[PDB]
Short mmCIF file of C-alpha atoms and ligand atoms in Angstrom, two decimals:
data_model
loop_
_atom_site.label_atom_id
_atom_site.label_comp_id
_atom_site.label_asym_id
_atom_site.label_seq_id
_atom_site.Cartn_x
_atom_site.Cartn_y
_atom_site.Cartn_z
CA UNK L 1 17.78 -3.37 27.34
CA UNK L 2 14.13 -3.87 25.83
CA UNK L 3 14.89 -7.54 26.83
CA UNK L 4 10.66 -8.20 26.95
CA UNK L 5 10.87 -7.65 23.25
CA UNK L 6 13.77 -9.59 22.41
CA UNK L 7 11.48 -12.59 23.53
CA UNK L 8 8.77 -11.56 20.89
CA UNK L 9 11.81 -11.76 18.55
CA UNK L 10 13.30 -15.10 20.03
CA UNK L 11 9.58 -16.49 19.14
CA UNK L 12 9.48 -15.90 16.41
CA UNK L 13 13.20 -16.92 15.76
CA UNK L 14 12.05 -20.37 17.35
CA UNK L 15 9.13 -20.93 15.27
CA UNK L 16 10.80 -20.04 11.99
CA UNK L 17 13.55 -22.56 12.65
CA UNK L 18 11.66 -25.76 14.55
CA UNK L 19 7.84 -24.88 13.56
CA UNK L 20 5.87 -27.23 11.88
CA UNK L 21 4.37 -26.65 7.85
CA UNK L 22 0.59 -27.33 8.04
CA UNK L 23 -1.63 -25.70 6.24
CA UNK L 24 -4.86 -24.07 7.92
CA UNK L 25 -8.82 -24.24 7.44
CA UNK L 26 -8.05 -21.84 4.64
CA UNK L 27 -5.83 -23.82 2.41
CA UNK L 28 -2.28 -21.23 3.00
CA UNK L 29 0.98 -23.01 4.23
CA UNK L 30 1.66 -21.61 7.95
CA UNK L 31 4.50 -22.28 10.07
CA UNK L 32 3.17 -23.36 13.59
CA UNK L 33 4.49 -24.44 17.21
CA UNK L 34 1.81 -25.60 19.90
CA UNK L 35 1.75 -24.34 23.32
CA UNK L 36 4.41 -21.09 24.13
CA UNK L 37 4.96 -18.77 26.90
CA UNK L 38 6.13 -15.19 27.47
CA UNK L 39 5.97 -12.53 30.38
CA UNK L 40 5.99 -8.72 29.25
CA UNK L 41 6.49 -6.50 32.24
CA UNK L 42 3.52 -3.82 32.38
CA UNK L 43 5.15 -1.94 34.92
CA UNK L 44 5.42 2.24 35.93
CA UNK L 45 3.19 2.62 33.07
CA UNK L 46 4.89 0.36 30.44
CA UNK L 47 2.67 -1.12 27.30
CA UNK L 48 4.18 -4.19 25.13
CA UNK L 49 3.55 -2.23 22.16
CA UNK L 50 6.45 -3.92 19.41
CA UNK L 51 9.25 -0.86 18.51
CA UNK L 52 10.81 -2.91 15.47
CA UNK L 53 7.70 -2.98 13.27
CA UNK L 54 4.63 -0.01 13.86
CA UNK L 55 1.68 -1.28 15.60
CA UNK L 56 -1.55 -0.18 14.79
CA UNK L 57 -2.00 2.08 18.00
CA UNK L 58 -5.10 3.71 16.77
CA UNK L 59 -6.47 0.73 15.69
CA UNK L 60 -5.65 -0.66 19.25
CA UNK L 61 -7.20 1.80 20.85
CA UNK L 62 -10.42 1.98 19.30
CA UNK L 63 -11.04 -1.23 18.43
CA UNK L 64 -10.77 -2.20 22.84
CA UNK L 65 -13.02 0.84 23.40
CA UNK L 66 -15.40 -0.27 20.83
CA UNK L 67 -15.44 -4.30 22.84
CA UNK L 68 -15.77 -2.17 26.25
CA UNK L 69 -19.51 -0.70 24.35
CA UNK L 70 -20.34 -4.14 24.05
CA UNK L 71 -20.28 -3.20 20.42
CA UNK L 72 -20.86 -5.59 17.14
CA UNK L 73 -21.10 -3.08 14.74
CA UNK L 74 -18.17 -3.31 12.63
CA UNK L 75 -19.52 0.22 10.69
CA UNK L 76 -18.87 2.16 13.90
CA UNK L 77 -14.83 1.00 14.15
CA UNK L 78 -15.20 1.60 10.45
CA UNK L 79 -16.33 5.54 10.96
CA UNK L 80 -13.52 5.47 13.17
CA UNK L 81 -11.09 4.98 10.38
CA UNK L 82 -10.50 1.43 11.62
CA UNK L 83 -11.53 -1.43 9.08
CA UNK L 84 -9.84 -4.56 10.43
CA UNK L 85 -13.46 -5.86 10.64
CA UNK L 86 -15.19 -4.24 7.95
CA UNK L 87 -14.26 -7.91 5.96
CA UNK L 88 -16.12 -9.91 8.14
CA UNK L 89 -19.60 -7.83 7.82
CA UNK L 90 -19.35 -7.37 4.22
CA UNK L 91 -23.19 -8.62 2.73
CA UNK L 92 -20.65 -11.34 0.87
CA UNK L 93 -18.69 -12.62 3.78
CA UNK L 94 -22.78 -12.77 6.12
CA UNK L 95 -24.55 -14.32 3.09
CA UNK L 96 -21.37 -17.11 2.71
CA UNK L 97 -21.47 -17.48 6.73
CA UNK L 98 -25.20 -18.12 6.32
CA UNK L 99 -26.48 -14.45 8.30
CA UNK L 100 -28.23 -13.73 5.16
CA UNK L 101 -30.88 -12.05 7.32
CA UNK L 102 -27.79 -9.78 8.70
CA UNK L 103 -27.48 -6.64 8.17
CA UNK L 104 -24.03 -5.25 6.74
CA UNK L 105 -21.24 -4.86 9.85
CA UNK L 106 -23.43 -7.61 11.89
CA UNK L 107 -20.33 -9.48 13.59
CA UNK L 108 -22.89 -11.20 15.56
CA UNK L 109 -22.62 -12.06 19.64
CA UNK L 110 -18.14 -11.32 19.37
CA UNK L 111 -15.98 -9.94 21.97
CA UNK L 112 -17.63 -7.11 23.37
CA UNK L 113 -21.39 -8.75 23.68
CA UNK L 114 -19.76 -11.47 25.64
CA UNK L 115 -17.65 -9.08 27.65
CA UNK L 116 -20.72 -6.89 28.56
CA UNK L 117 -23.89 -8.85 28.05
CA UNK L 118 -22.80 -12.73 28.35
CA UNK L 119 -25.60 -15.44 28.28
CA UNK L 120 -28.01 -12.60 26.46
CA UNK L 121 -29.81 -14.03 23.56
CA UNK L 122 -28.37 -12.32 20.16
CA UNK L 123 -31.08 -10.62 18.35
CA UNK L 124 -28.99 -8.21 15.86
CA UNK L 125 -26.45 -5.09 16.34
CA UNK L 126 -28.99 -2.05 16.69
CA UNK L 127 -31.06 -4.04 19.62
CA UNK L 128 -30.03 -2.33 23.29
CA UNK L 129 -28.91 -4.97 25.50
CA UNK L 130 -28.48 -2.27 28.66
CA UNK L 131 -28.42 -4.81 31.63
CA UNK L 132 -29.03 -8.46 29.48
CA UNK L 133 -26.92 -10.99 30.34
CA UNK L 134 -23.66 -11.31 32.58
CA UNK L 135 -21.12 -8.06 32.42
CA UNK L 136 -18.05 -10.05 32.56
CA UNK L 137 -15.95 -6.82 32.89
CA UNK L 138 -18.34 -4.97 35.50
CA UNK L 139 -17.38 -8.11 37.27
CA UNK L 140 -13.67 -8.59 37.03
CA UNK L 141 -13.75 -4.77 38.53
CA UNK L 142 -15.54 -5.48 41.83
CA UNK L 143 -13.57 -8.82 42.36
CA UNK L 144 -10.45 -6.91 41.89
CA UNK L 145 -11.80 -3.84 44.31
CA UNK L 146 -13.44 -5.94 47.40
CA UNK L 147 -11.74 -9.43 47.03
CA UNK L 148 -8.00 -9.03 44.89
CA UNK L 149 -6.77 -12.07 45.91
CA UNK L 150 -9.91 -14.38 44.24
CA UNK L 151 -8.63 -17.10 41.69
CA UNK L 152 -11.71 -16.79 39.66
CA UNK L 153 -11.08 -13.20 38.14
CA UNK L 154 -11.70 -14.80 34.43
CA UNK L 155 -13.01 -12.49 31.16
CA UNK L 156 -13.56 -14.98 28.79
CA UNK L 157 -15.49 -14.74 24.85
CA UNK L 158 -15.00 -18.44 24.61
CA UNK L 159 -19.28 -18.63 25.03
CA UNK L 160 -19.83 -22.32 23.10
CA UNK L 161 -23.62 -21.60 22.59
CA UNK L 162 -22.61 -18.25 20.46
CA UNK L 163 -19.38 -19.20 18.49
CA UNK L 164 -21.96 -20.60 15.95
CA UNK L 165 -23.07 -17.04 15.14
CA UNK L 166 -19.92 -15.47 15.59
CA UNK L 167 -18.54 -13.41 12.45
CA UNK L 168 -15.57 -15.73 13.60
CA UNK L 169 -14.69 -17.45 16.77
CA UNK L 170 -12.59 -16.05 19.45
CA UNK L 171 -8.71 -16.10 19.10
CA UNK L 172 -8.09 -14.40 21.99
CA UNK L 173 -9.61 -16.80 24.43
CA UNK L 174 -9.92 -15.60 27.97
CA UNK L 175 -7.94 -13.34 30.39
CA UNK L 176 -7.47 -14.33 34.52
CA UNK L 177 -6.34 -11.46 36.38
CA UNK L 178 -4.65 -11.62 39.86
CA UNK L 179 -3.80 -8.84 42.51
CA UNK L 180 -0.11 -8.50 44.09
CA UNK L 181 1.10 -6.13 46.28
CA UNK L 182 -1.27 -3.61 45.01
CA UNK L 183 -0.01 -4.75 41.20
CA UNK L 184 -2.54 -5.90 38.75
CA UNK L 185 -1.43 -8.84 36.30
CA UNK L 186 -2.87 -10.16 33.41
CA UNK L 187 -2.26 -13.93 31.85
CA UNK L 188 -3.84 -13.90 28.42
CA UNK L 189 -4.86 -17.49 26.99
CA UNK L 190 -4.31 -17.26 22.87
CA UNK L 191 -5.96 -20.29 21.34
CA UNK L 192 -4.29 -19.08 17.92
CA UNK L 193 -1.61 -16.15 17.44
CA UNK L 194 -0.46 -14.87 14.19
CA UNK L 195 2.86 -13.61 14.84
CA UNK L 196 3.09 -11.11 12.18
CA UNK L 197 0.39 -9.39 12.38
CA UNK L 198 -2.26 -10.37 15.43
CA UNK L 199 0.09 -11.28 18.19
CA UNK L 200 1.45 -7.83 18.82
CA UNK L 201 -2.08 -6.06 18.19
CA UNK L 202 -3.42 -8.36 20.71
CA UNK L 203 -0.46 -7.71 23.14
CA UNK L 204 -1.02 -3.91 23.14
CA UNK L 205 -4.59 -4.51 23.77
CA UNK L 206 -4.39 -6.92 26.63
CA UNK L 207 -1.57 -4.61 27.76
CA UNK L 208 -3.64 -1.33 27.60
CA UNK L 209 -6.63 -3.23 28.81
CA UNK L 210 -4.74 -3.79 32.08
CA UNK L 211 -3.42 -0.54 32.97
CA UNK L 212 -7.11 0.58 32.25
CA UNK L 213 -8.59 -1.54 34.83
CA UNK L 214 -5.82 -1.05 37.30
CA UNK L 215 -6.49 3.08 36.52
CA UNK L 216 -10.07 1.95 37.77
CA UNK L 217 -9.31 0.20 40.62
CA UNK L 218 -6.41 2.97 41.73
CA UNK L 219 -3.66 -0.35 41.80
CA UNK L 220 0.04 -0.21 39.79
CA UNK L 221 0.34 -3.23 37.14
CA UNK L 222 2.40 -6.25 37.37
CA UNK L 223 2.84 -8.59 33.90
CA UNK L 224 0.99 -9.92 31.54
CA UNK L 225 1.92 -13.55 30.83
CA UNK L 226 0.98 -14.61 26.94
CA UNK L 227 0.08 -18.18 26.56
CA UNK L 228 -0.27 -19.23 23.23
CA UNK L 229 -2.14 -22.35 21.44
CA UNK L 230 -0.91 -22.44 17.81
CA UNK L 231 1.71 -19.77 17.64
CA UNK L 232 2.09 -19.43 13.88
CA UNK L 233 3.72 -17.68 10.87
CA UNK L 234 1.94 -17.68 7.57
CA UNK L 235 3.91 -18.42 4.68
CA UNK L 236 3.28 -15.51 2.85
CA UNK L 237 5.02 -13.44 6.03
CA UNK L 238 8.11 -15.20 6.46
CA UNK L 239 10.63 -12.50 4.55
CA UNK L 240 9.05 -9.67 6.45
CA UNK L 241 9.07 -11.64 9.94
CA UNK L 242 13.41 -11.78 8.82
CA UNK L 243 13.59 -8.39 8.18
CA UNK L 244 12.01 -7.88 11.03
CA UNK L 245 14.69 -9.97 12.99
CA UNK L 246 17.24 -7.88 11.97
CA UNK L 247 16.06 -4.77 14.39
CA UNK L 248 17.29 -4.06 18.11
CA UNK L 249 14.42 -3.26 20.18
CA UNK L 250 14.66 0.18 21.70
CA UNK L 251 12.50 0.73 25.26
CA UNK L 252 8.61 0.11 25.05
CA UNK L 253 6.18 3.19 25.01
CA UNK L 254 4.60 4.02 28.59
CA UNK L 255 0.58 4.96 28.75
CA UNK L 256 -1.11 7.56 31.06
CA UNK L 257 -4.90 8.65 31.35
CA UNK L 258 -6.67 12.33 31.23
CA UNK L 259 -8.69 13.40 33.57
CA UNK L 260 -11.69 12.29 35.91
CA UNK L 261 -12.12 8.54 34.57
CA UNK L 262 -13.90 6.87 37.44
CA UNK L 263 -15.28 3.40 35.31
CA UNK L 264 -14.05 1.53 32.99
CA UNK L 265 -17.03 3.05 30.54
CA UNK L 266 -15.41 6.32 31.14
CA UNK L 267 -12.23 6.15 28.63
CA UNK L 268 -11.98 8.01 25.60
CA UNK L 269 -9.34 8.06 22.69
CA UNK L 270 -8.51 11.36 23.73
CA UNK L 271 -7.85 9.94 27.54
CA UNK L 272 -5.43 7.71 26.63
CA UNK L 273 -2.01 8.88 26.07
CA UNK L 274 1.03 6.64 24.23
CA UNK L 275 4.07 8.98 25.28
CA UNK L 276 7.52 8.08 23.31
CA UNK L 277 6.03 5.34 20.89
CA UNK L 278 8.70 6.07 17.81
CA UNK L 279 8.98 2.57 16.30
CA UNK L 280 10.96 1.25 13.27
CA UNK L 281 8.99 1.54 9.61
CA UNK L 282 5.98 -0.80 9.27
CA UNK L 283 6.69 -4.10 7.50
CA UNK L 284 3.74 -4.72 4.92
CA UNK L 285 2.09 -8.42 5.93
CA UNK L 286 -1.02 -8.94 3.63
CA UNK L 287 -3.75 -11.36 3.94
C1 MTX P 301 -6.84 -8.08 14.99
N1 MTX P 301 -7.07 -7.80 13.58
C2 MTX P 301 -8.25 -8.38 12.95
C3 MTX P 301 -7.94 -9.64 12.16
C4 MTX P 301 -9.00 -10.26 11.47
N2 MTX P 301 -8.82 -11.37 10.74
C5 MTX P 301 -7.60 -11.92 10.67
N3 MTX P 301 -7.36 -13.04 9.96
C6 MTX P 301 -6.12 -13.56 9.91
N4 MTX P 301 -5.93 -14.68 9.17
N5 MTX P 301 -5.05 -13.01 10.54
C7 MTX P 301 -5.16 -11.90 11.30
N6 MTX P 301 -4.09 -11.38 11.94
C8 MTX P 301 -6.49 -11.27 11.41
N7 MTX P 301 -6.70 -10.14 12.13
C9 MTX P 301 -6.22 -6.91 12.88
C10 MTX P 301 -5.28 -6.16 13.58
C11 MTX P 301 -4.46 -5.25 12.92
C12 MTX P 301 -4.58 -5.08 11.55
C13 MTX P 301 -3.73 -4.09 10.82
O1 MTX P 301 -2.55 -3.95 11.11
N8 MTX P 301 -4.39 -3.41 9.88
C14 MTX P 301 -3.84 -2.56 8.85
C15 MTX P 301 -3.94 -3.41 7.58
C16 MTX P 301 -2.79 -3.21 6.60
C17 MTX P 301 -2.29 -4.53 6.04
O2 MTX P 301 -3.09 -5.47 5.83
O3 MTX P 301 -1.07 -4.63 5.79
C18 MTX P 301 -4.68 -1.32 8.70
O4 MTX P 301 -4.12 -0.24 8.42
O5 MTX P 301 -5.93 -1.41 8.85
C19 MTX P 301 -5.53 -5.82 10.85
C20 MTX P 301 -6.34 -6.73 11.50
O1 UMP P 302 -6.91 -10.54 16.98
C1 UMP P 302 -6.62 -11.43 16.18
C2 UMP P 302 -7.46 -11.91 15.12
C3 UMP P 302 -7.02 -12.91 14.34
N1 UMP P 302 -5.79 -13.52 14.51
C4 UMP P 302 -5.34 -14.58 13.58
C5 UMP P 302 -4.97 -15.92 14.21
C6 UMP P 302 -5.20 -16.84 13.02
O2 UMP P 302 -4.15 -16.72 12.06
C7 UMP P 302 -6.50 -16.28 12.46
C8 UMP P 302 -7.76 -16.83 13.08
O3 UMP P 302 -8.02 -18.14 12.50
P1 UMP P 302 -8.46 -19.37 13.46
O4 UMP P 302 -7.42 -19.51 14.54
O5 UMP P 302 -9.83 -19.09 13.97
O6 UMP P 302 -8.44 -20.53 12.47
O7 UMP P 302 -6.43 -14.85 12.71
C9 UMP P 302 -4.92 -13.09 15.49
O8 UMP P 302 -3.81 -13.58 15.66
N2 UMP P 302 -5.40 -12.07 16.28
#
């Protein structure tokens, strides 16, 4: 019945069987198709988040609320309980990057600067940059609210000037948005997807991302369409990706928000509710 997931699964299936062995910038062996498609339905409240292998829901959740800050701080996701980017702010990883004048959790300009404060000129984590630069997101809202049917709704971290001092460059690219009969959709552009372990984080965020929005905007959802660049598997994930295989999908959690949230500064952890999320045991996929 969960036949959105059962695409996920067919993906990977497909890549497993007809990818390509190249190994990355890194050296590892990965297991890569160029250039694939799915559509997720988003609606009544429904959130691609996978049921055959635990997703990281906290670390969903906090990690989008920390972009929507315009946050680079990696130490705040950290107090959070959240260290998927405590790695790339390490004093090791800034002083091999060449930020040795970086302080520790420094991500540099990353997803939420560009988000909130795009074109503003980077000058450290602890500077306020209140009303610098271009808020992408500020902007998405009133294009969606006065003028739904624009073809230039775009949120995009893909800023050329800034990947240089980037903690790493974008993987998740840009997002256009579009209004239909009163449904908000959502096609995500993936220059690179791991499919283990990224690819379904990032599909609960760009999922939860657009019911937020539409919660702002007082519009139902639509889809979200995932376009992928290199859709890969590394190596080292292969046996868990076909354990993984194995498991029937069962239906996909639905989302609803707490409260008076009026912008899309507004959310908290606590407004954001995951109602019948029980998925299959997590499959351990190291890097
Ligand atoms: C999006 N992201 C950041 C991130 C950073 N660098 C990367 N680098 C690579 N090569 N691949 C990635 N998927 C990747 N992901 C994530 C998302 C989820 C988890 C995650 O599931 N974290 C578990 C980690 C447990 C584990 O490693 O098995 C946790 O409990 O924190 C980690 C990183
Ligand atoms: O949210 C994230 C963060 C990272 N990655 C993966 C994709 C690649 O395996 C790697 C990034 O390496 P490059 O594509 O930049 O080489 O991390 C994701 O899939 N999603």
């Amino acid at each position: 019945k969960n036949e959105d997931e059962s695409k996920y699964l067919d993906q990977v299936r497909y890549i497993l069987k007809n990818g390509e062995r190249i190994d990355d910038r890194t050296g590892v062996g990965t297991i890569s198709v160029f250039g694939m498609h799915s559509v997720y339905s988003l609606r009544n409240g429904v959130v691609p988040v996978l049921t055959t292998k635990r997703v990281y829901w906290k670390g969903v959740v906090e990690e989008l609320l920390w972009f929507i800050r315009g946050d680079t701080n990696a130490k705040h996701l950290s107090e959070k309980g959240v260290r998927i980017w405590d790695a790339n702010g390490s004093r090791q990883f800034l002083d091999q990057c060449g930020f040795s004048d970086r302080s520790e959790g420094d991500l540099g300009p990353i997803y939420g600067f560009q988000w909130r404060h795009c074109g503003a000129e980077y000058r450290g984590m602890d500077t306020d940059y209140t009303n610098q630069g271009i808020d992408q997101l500020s902007e998405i809202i009133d294009l969606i609210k006065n003028e739904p049917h624009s073809r230039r709704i775009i949120l995009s971290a893909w800023n050329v000037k800034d990947l240089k001092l980037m903690a790493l460059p974008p993987c998740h690219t840009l997002a256009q948005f579009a209004v239909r009969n009163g449904e908000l959709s959502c096609q995500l552009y993936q220059r690179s997807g791991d499919m283990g372990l990224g690819v379904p984080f990032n599909l609960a965020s760009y999922g939860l991302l657009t019911h937020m929005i539409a919660h702002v905007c007082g519009l139902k959802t639509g889809h979200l369409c995932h376009v992928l660049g290199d859709a890969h598997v590394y190596m080292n994930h292969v046996d868990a990706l076909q354990e993984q295989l194995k498991r029937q999908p069962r239906q996909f959690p639905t989302v609803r928000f707490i409260g008076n949230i009026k912008t899309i500064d507004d959310f908290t952890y606590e407004s954001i509710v995951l109602e019948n999320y029980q998925p299959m045991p997590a499959i351990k996929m190291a890097m």
